[PDB]
Amino acid sequence: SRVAKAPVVVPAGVDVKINGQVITIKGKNGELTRTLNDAVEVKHADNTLTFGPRDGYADGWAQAGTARALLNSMVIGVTEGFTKKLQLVGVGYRAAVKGNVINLSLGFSHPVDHQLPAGITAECPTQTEIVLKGADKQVIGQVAADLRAYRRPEPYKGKGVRYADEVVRTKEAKK
Amino acid sequence: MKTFTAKPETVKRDWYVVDATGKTLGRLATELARRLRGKHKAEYTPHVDTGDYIIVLNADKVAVTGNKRTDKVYYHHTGHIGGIKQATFEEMIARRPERVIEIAVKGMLPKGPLGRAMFRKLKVYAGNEHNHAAQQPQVLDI
Amino acid sequence: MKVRASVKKLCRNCKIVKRDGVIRVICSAEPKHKQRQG
Amino acid sequence: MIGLVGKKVGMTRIFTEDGVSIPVTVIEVEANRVTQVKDLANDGYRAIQVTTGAKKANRVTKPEAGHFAKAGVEAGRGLWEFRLAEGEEFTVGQSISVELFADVKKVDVTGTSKGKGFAGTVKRWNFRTQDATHGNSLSHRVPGSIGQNQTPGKVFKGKKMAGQMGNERVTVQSLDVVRVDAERNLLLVKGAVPGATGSDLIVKPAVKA
RNA sequence: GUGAAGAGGGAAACAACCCAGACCGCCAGCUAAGGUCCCAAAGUCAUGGUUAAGUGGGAAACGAUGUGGGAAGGCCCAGAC
RNA sequence: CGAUGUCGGCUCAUCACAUCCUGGGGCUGAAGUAGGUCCCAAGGGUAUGGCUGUUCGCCAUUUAAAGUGGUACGCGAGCUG
RNA sequence: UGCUGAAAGCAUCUAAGCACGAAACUUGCCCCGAGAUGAGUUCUCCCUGACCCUUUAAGGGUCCUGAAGGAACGUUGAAGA
Ligand SMILES: [Mg+2]
Ligand SMILES: [Mg+2]
Ligand SMILES: [Mg+2]
Ligand SMILES: [Mg+2]
Ligand SMILES: [Mg+2]
Ligand SMILES: [Mg+2]
Ligand SMILES: [Mg+2]
Ligand SMILES: [Mg+2]
Ligand SMILES: [Mg+2]
Ligand SMILES: [Mg+2]
Ligand SMILES: [Mg+2]
Ligand SMILES: [Mg+2]
Ligand SMILES: [Mg+2]
Ligand SMILES: [Mg+2]
Ligand SMILES: [Mg+2]
Ligand SMILES: [Mg+2]
Ligand SMILES: [Mg+2]
Ligand SMILES: [Mg+2]
Ligand SMILES: [Mg+2]
Ligand SMILES: [Mg+2]
Ligand SMILES: [Mg+2]
Ligand SMILES: [Mg+2]
Ligand SMILES: [Mg+2]
Ligand SMILES: [Mg+2]
Ligand SMILES: [Mg+2]
Ligand SMILES: [Mg+2]
Ligand SMILES: [Mg+2]
Ligand SMILES: [Mg+2]
Ligand SMILES: [Mg+2]
Ligand SMILES: [Mg+2]
Ligand SMILES: [Mg+2]
Ligand SMILES: [Mg+2]
Ligand SMILES: [Mg+2]
Ligand SMILES: [Mg+2]
Ligand SMILES: [Mg+2]
Ligand SMILES: [Mg+2]
Ligand SMILES: [Zn+2]
Fold it and tell me: How far, in Å, is the CA of D85 from the C1' of nucleotide F58?
């Protein structure tokens, strides 16, 4: 609807290929590909992508608005990239990177190693901070969710892996 | 006079190939059970098998509507006391996909010795190929 | 997770959402308010 | 990995230096020689067919003796078959020695157990005997009740009752191999394998590791 | 009113419900209730809607931005939400 | 009612899940340990004695736990009496 | 429990798409198992005679032939009523 009516402007240096329902968006940061729902009609009006309900479908504007914000995110991913920052709160908690294997040390009896996916690159500025970058927004949010999932932050001290921007509602242990 | 009956020695039967890609399960199966019974022939006789041999291929690509791909359940019982078993539709396609067409048609044929003889003419295949080129089967469109 | 027959908004931050055929109350503020109709 | 066909020689013990007595089962393993190599193009699966021992020449039948003559090998006392893993192959007339188990550590020994004959439910299914006194009328080792009243006019399938015990294929898993003596064709596994003395055994490397 | 003392058809099976009262014969026709995808006789009928729950094909107080239709209202290109 | 043997024990059981243990979770007035509570889950496991005809119950001492029910208050052409 | 994400400029685990998640489920382990009448597969072995017949057909008979193998018998078994 209101999201889908607003067209997505392709910048310069961003190659867009429409192919049925398959759309490959290239750029200086990589290529991204997504098969759309069959309820979505996509067409390139020479500087913008537009998004209309294909006929004979119930959720016309609902599927189109999903198809808008994805290809909006595919454009921003191939010209800027996404960057999700994580920090580690807790004594002795740290992280190290070996190419694409983040080596977490989260107070377990066993080492924690996380294999990174394909288009995702990570970096630790500090031992208690993880910064990971990449193109696809769904994937960097997934990797950030996986690294958060090892130590979901305790409400009594905020201890554990958190997002660098989120708020952690704490709790006092009463007596 | 008396009403004609078909005779099992003089009856002739034919061969058909049906492609089951994308077709609805029950709407395919009722046309197979119509043609295995022999109710498309004017010389139909209830106590005589007058139907046609039918080869069904691409049995793993049959389609069902709704949520029945994950919610239609095929129960059976092994005879032993805990022996209730259970498989969903998409597990049956992965495990042994020929049974799905076979179970649907077997429920639509008559029950008895003749209905089991009608089921022997249904020859289903998961793949896109068959060893029955020697019988010269025609392409049946359903 | 409260599981009830009657699920209701308990504060201003409750949001009634239907996830997979189940009416669910989720609250960003209070974890006591999260509900599930069952 | 394939296994080998041996024979239960008997049991003995290996005194270690440390003062530990290991109860071992001597399994002589003669040279298993392959008789047929099975593959995907002809047979649908990958396996080999081996033979061991000797057999009286007047007793091996013409269908059976022709099967050894195609492989070109002496007739053995039986024919067994071992499924092949991938990347593992054998020729037809190849002989396989007990040095195959030189570097395994646990094996599974499959044999036919001893025949207990028609056994009652005290012996077979470990039922409790009833009371040997206090009034018991002719019912000291009987199975007792076997069902319920009218709800299931019937005894269920697989009800534990009397019948044949033993004389059947059983497999003891994860037996520690003690010694592999290639010179006199032996194989010492820790513990007791199924079968009587002199019966055929199938020794395979342990699948549960 | 039916059964008892009443068969036939339908309701899976089902004295008492629904349709209908068996003098006999027929390898004739029309209908009733109930039905017409297959088991199983007859519409894969037509036109216009509704449902996405296998609801249909078992149940309440109560709960819910499920969804379809209608009538009204207060905010609103003086810029709302 | 021209016979459907009955309380408890014994010996075989078998099913349900409204779960006692073990498994997975949510919330906690959840620091940890240990809990409370609810959700999912029936795969396996699930005492021995004292007293009493007892089921039950109390008591002693165990155990990860000593589940609740259906089964003609399961089971006498199997036993006990 | 999530990720991305609209319908509903926000929000949202879901409607499209994706990820994780239990002794349950299907496998993995063991055993039976082609009467699986849908009766499967592989390998090897054995038989390469003459004639009559009328109702001429998956026909009946004669003489010659008797294989591979099996069965019976005997000695028996850590197999067995
Ligand atoms: Mg779910
Ligand atoms: Mg409840
Ligand atoms: Mg014996
Ligand atoms: Mg006793
Ligand atoms: Mg007596
Ligand atoms: Mg006695
Ligand atoms: Mg009785
Ligand atoms: Mg019965
Ligand atoms: Mg009377
Ligand atoms: Mg009547
Ligand atoms: Mg009637
Ligand atoms: Mg009824
Ligand atoms: Mg009837
Ligand atoms: Mg008419
Ligand atoms: Mg009518
Ligand atoms: Mg019938
Ligand atoms: Mg019909
Ligand atoms: Mg129509
Ligand atoms: Mg405003
Ligand atoms: Mg009486
Ligand atoms: Mg009587
Ligand atoms: Mg439950
Ligand atoms: Mg808890
Ligand atoms: Mg069970
Ligand atoms: Mg149990
Ligand atoms: Mg079960
Ligand atoms: Mg299991
Ligand atoms: Mg007691
Ligand atoms: Mg009762
Ligand atoms: Mg009783
Ligand atoms: Mg009980
Ligand atoms: Mg009794
Ligand atoms: Mg007395
Ligand atoms: Mg959004
Ligand atoms: Mg979100
Ligand atoms: Mg998974
Ligand atoms: Zn709230």
Answer: 66
